[PDB]
Amino acid sequence: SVKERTEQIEHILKSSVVKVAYGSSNPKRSEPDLNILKDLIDSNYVVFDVLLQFLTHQDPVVTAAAAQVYIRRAYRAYTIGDIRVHEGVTVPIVEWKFQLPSAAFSTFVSVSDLSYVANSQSLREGILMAVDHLDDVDEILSQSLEVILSNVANVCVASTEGFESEEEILVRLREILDLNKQELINASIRRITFMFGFKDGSYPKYYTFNGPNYNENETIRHIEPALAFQLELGRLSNFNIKPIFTDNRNIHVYEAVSKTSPLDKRFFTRGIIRTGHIRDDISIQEYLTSEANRLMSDILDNLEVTDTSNSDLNHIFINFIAVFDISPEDVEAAFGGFLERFGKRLLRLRVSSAEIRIIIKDPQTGAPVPLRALINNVSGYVIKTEMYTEVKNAKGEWVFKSLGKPGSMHLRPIATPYPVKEWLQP
Ligand SMILES: [Cl-]
């Protein structure tokens, strides 16, 4: 598939550009047909693993249809405006304008910086720039910013040949930052992101640095900031969070300490399952349960290497991003006995509960419907799985809605931060 989709894309991009029949030559600078690109933007399969390489595609005319797809699919939670394909000193530059609505996503003025609050009255621009190699950046960046804390810059980087440790790429990027610092600031760039594509099907890496001192935002290291909501970080707001980096980049583990009570330590792992290919043979239900399983294995191994000293209510959050043909009952099926298979490992590790998020193609409407399975180890006697949908309530906030008989969180708002151990308060 990684081959097939890598090719599948090429045809879709160039087919968006091409406007004319054989022999007559096509227009030098022409807009791409969004009806034709739409089926690549609104796709349930992964796209970002295979797409970045086409931003430094040879031709500058698909490069721009590549850009749009990226922007238009990263900013699925935003109200996107219009996009201009500019032309820099060297490589092209793409500018999109955008703004965020008030129920954009499950846990509700920006997605990645939850402290960016604005009134009922706010103006937000973004740059996309492709580069070929990290050395290219410094020259490109300053000129690029000129098309002018509220803006956003995403920089793609087609190669890092001649680099070894991340950490040496990190302080390269820090150099590049601290040399353009005041110039980034003048473009009111709130958050800039370097995104390194790949070819064998690995998911891009992401580095993001914020604010006036462009220090790295560790908490959203390998996720496009626009989609960081898939991590649902807001729900950790009663804890001082800190990442623990891992070799699996679909996995974001965080040490949490209740601000209120330094003795309430936990680890929240939040894994993400994008999907690029399902096998013909197997059921959907069968697919959900292997990767869930896989992911929980990879997850458990990291905790069984990390120092989980006085942790207690350790928590796992698996997030599927695709849409699936399956049924709520079949979904619930798949996670029957899900943890039990891990009982001794979850026991030794103090993992008390796990939450899965799946989306279901509605049989009739064909529209996507979000489920949560909340599995709770507590009351150790048995494991209860409570199944919800997500619904907008009276107030306008997304909310759990049980599938059967009311559950623990039957109409709680999905954004509810995990409660703290209060009895540990002085
Ligand atoms: Cl993607």
Residue numbers in the entry: 1036 to 1143, 1156 to 1169, 1172 to 1197, 1218 to 1495
Which text from the study accompanies this structure?
Acetyl-CoA carboxylases (ACCs) have crucial roles in fatty acid biosynthesis and oxidation and are promising targets for drug discovery against diabetes, cancer and other diseases. ACC carries two distinct catalytic activities, biotin carboxylase (BC) and carboxyltransferase (CT), and its biotin is linked covalently to the biotin carboxyl carrier protein (BCCP). Although bacterial ACCs contain multiple subunits that support these different functions, most eukaryotic ACCs are single-chain, multi-domain enzymes with a molecular weight of ~250 kDa and are active as dimers and higher oligomers. The unique central region of ACC, with five domains (AC1–AC5, AC: ACC Central), is located at the sides, far away from the two active sites.
